[PDB]
Design a protein around this ligand. Sequence first.
Ligand SMILES: O=[N+]([O-])c1ccc(O)cc1
Ligand SMILES: O=[N+]([O-])c1ccc(O)cc1
Ligand SMILES: [Ca+2]
Ligand SMILES: [Ca+2]
Ligand SMILES: [Ca+2]
Ligand SMILES: [Ca+2]
Ligand SMILES: [Ca+2]
Ligand SMILES: [Ca+2]
Ligand SMILES: [Ca+2]
Ligand SMILES: [Ca+2]
Ligand SMILES: [Ca+2]
Ligand SMILES: [Ca+2]
Ligand SMILES: [Ca+2]
Ligand SMILES: [Ca+2]
Ligand SMILES: [Ca+2]
Ligand SMILES: [Ca+2]
Ligand SMILES: [Ca+2]
Ligand SMILES: [Ca+2]
Ligand SMILES: [Ca+2]
Ligand SMILES: [Ca+2]
Ligand SMILES: [Ca+2]
Ligand SMILES: [Ca+2]
Ligand SMILES: [Ca+2]
Ligand SMILES: [Ca+2]
Lengths: 608, 616
Amino acid sequence: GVYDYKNFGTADSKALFSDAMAITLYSYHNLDNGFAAGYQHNGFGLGLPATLVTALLGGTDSQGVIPGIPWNPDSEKLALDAVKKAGWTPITASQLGYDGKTDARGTFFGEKAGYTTAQVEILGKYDAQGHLTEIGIAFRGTSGPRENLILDSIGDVINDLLAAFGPKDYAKNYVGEAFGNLLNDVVAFAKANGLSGKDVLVSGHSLGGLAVNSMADLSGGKWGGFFADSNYIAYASPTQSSTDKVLNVGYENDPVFRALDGSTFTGASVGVHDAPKESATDNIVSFNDHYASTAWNLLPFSILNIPTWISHLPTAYGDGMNRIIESKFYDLTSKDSTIIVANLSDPARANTWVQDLNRNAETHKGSTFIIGSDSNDLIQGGSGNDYLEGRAGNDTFRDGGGYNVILGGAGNNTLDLQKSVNTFDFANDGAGNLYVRDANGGISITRDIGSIVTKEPDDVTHSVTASGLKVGSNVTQYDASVKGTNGADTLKAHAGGDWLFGLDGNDHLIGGVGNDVFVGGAGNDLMESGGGADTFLFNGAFGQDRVVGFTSNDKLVFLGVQGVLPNDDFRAHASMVGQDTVLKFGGDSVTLVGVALNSLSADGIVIA
Amino acid sequence: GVYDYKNFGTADSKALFSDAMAITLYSYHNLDNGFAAGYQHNGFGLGLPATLVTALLGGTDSQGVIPGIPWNPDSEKLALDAVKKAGWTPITASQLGYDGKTDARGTFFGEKAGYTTAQVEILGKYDAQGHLTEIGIAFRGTSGPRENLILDSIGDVINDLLAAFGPKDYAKNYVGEAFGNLLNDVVAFAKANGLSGKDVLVSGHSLGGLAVNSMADLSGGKWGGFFADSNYIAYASPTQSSTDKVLNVGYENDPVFRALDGSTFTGASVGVHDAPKESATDNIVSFNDHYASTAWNLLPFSILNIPTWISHLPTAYGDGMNRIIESKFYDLTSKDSTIIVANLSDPARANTWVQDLNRNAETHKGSTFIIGSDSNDLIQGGSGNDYLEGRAGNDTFRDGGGYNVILGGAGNNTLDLQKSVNTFDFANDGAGNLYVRDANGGISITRDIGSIVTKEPGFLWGLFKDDVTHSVTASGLKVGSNVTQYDASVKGTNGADTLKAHAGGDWLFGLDGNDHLIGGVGNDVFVGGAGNDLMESGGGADTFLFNGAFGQDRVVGFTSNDKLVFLGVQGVLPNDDFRAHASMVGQDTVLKFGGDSVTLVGVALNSLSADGIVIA
Ligand SMILES: O=[N+]([O-])c1ccc(O)cc1
Ligand SMILES: O=[N+]([O-])c1ccc(O)cc1
Ligand SMILES: [Ca+2]
Ligand SMILES: [Ca+2]
Ligand SMILES: [Ca+2]
Ligand SMILES: [Ca+2]
Ligand SMILES: [Ca+2]
Ligand SMILES: [Ca+2]
Ligand SMILES: [Ca+2]
Ligand SMILES: [Ca+2]
Ligand SMILES: [Ca+2]
Ligand SMILES: [Ca+2]
Ligand SMILES: [Ca+2]
Ligand SMILES: [Ca+2]
Ligand SMILES: [Ca+2]
Ligand SMILES: [Ca+2]
Ligand SMILES: [Ca+2]
Ligand SMILES: [Ca+2]
Ligand SMILES: [Ca+2]
Ligand SMILES: [Ca+2]
Ligand SMILES: [Ca+2]
Ligand SMILES: [Ca+2]
Ligand SMILES: [Ca+2]
Ligand SMILES: [Ca+2]
């Protein structure tokens, strides 16, 4: 998964991530709520001024920067409720025996001259019995309490500038200078409750993400080494720690994220700074109105170009990256997977195709994951390999080719092929999967898409049904198939070639002399070629399969399988066990009985 | 004057400048109206979020960037009315037989790909019988019609960056590309109405400023050299043409103004870029809440730091520099005079002293002019020579020393001396001038200041201090029963007088007419006044004061320990000394200031000392 941390599992990394995000959002007290809400209603073009109005004054359903407006919701109380729902309660100055500054909200303030506009939240997670199980440390990014926002932000900006232009270790030392004493008190509080370093989660966004990385850098040597084994997840940090301790998360089109190299100002800092970084998720795109706009991007991409900071908004981090977490494709992803998160305004969503424009970024490689909104989206896959997720709402998909998984989700979803129905083959396994094979052999596996649109010289809409694609009474037939059951089946192909669908269970698929398409499905399947030019398709947790009679003109296709790193080919996954080539993908495998590994070519083995 | 242009002279260059601003402001159609008004009410600190709200949404008495808000006034109609009141009516595409694009306001739009967001207004002035007398060309700075603000602004900023980073002479060619055909039709419409190049005034602000300079660069070769001798006044231009045709007016703390040299991006472009430029007004400060703030100025001054852009606003240009135009000190100033304009918000004005902080600029040289607002101001002159103008409102002045003129203006005004009344001498000519002399001999000439505040040793033998308000009266400064006497005086009349000093020393006030002022052995202060005055020392350490149109005067018996003081006199370029004004005529040293002169009968120029000749 993209947010895998240390040696924690997929699940435990996700739980850690969701908490780091919750506490990160809490630290800003919904300051960007009005901005996020303005943007969602108005967009970033024409309506940019209306968006900015709401950033300042909010409206009937959001609070901007300005406090005390009667018709605004109490966003700060919503922020507190939200962090509590996630399991977190602010630890008071008095619980910690802390003698520095807090405000009326329990926020901690930086301790030394030059650091007094620093903010941190210290939070506790408590079990059913009311015992402390976890501590959250959430450093605030640039900005402060609504009461003193301008003055506090000026202080923060000086700190921001010093990270780039000040003493060499200025970023590294920031948490040491700002909260050295506070953190000694946190160590005593943790010890007193039977906790150690491993029970502490450290997070924050932007300047707060800089602080995450500062704390990691100081953790070996300061506070008695107590925090050395803590959990550090930083959002949109300009810096990266010298250590291996920090998961540096952000959007690649956020100009704050990785602006510095790990603390160094370079020529790239004021432009595109998208070089691969070991600690960082390098390829997550916020597909927002700015990113989509041809006119916006006639201007140079730069932290100095203020409208580019739309991709920096903490609500867009929380909302879009939570949908990554929730994705049916999540466990296919790793740290540097290309993921395009649908983050369009309401007006832009109506007429803009979410797609990998690869704008202002180094060239994307490997498969692409595109994550929709819970509203009606237009999602456009590339000509390489795509995982398209609609989520809720009536979604429309296009895709330029290759090997794809298209999940409609809830709603009435539509796949627009933009070409004649005669240039495709269709197959259906009777268990919710519609297979679409294009004129070049590329296969899409689709679920929850009930309508196919084609061009017939010009748009024609086909209903996806059990007997074929239907335009009223008119049927485009599915390719010849033998459907199994979720029981163990023996299925035999006709000499003309068939699609063979195992479904669950350990199945025996017997190909014939024709061109068959084998889909063993879940369970450990035995699949025999029988001759011809055959395709074997593996998707999801496909089991341990054996393929008999695989030859030179046969194709393996791996799609939606575990452990595929961006751009992996078959050699990353192939070995010889006895006289057989084995291809392994997570816990799943294909055994090509009697096939020498040196006989295989990438044109015969599709890895997506 | 600071805005003298070509050879139009003082008065006509001022009228030209007021037209330029009028049409410049028109081109923006009151876009910054809500910002100006939000700033005035809220300021730029704690009040900033509210200021920005008003910038976007306006209010009941302003319109911000967003059109069609029912309760805003129609600020676009107000702009049109304003430009008309100034004598100008936009010329239709039809009168020009122009085939390009205009919008519903009659604004002309740029003609080629990459210039379609350029905007220009073409306006005409008309005599009493309806004939055209003058054409105005106002190029719009970045921004465009409210209908399409953002996309239009994007196009403009793309143009802005190409001026910095694009083809050599991109800025020079901007008007050629954007408005080449428009300008051919204007030449033909000018000729058909009997006008030539000299009846055309070309202006605009920011990128509209860059366009002024472009048009001047191109005027020799294009359009048949028709506009070669046109009139060119640019505001807040990032660029300066290679010609001698452009007056480049701006605030020195406006980060856009002179950002480029004169179309070249340097290391200074993103910082302070305050090198003297021949074509530019180099030393005008917008004294605004940003400029005044210690907190704001922790951040580096740069065009890249958006809050510094407060000094760029066209309304603050209009309002600020029109007060310079109107100043009683105007005709003392020259292109590079240090002028500080009171531009504070209502909240900051109540507690912030307007002063030359010399922030984010080269060291200011020469006398300083500080121009107040029509409200109650706090104005602080420096330790060098100052001209402080309160205007209307109840103003309070302070000043650090030197030789000064302090015009209280209308209102109840106060001079706060911040130390003991005993450390000053006071004189009064009965013609409205109260002279204030400090312990170092520094003299301030004050008008319309009815109160003097001093700081006196008070309780516990001077541990504590009392602030004492004296009223300026005919018999002296008065606080209750206590009268601070004026220094001994002889006063003339507005006709020709002979006035004799007593042996202890007198202030001798000639007033108008050709007077004979006879000094004594004492230390006299001579003020010949208007007219041609003969003034004899008589011995002692004497002072001769010259202010205004002081005439052709003769000084007899001037020695080593005497002193001339020129204050509020013509032709004093920033930091002039006597040498730039002095010559020998026969046996005498003559000092010349505009049409006024002092002859130091018998004195050799070589014997003179900057010590004894104060030029302010
Ligand atoms: O948190 N933030 O970075 C913000 C929040 C609100 C805003 O209007 C601008 C920036
Ligand atoms: O002209 N301008 O630069 C402006 C004017 C108004 C405004 O709200 C923003 C910018
Ligand atoms: Ca802060
Ligand atoms: Ca990486
Ligand atoms: Ca990248
Ligand atoms: Ca959707
Ligand atoms: Ca694809
Ligand atoms: Ca859907
Ligand atoms: Ca089965
Ligand atoms: Ca099976
Ligand atoms: Ca076969
Ligand atoms: Ca074969
Ligand atoms: Ca299987
Ligand atoms: Ca424009
Ligand atoms: Ca100059
Ligand atoms: Ca200057
Ligand atoms: Ca002074
Ligand atoms: Ca005043
Ligand atoms: Ca006054
Ligand atoms: Ca007289
Ligand atoms: Ca004398
Ligand atoms: Ca006289
Ligand atoms: Ca005289
Ligand atoms: Ca003498």
